[PDB]
From a paper:
In this study, we report the crystal structures of three forms of Tk-PTP, which showed that this protein forms a canonical DUSP fold and that it undergoes an atypical temperature-dependent conformational change between two forms. Structural and biochemical analyses revealed that this structural alteration requires the presence of the GG motif in the P-loop, and that Tk-PTP has dual amino acids, Asp63 and Glu132, both functioning as the general acid/base residues. PTP proteins commonly share a highly conserved active site motif called the PTP signature motif, which is also present in Tk-PTP as HC93MGGLGR99. This motif, constituting the phosphate binding loop (or simply called P-loop), contains the catalytic cysteine residue (Cys93) that functions as a nucleophile for dephosphorylation and the conserved arginine residue (Arg99) that anchors the phosphate group of the substrate during the enzyme reaction.
Residue numbers in the entry: 0 to 147
Write the structure that this text describes.
């Protein structure tokens, strides 16, 4: 049994909506690290709630319905990879589990598997229909595709 809102895009990495504080114990049973993409005002609890449960945080705030830069994306991907190499499972989350986190998940499959944007987008949207919500989110993935 695993937290049922985790949408796995490979064996070790998943994306999701925001976990409530009362869900963190269950999340922490399977995930060692979390990439938090919401801005501080969106958090209903301190990010220390993750750390105290043994879940290492990368806070990479992106305003809702906007896109990270390609440079930010590459930083997040290396951080995920570092933890996957240690045998850890990693969760990526935003608020809805669709746009910000879907964008990072697409980027992750491109980076980790060499998938085309099309292939990676199809797989992420099979896990969460509607993932990658805005034009600018699509554009930064095209920009990333050119560079990896
Ligand atoms: O809070 V999300 O960009 O689905």
């Amino acid at each position: 049994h695993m937290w049922p809102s985790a949408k796995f895009i490979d064996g070790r990495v998943a994306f999701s909506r925001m976990p409530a504080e009362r869900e963190l114990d269950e999340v922490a049973r399977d995930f060692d690290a979390v990439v938090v993409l919401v801005e501080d005002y969106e958090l209903p609890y301190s990010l220390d709630e993750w750390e105290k449960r043994g879940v290492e945080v990368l806070h990479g705030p992106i305003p809702d319905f906007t896109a990270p830069s390609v440079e930010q994306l590459l930083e997040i991907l290396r951080w995920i990879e570092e933890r996957v190499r240690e045998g850890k499972k990693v969760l990526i989350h935003c608020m809805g589990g669709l746009g910000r986190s879907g964008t990072v998940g697409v980027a992750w499959l491109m980076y980790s598997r060499g998938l085309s944007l099309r292939e990676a987008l199809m797989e992420v949207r099979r896990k969460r229909p509607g993932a990658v919500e805005t034009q600018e989110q699509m554009e930064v993935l095209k920009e990333l595709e050119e560079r990896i």
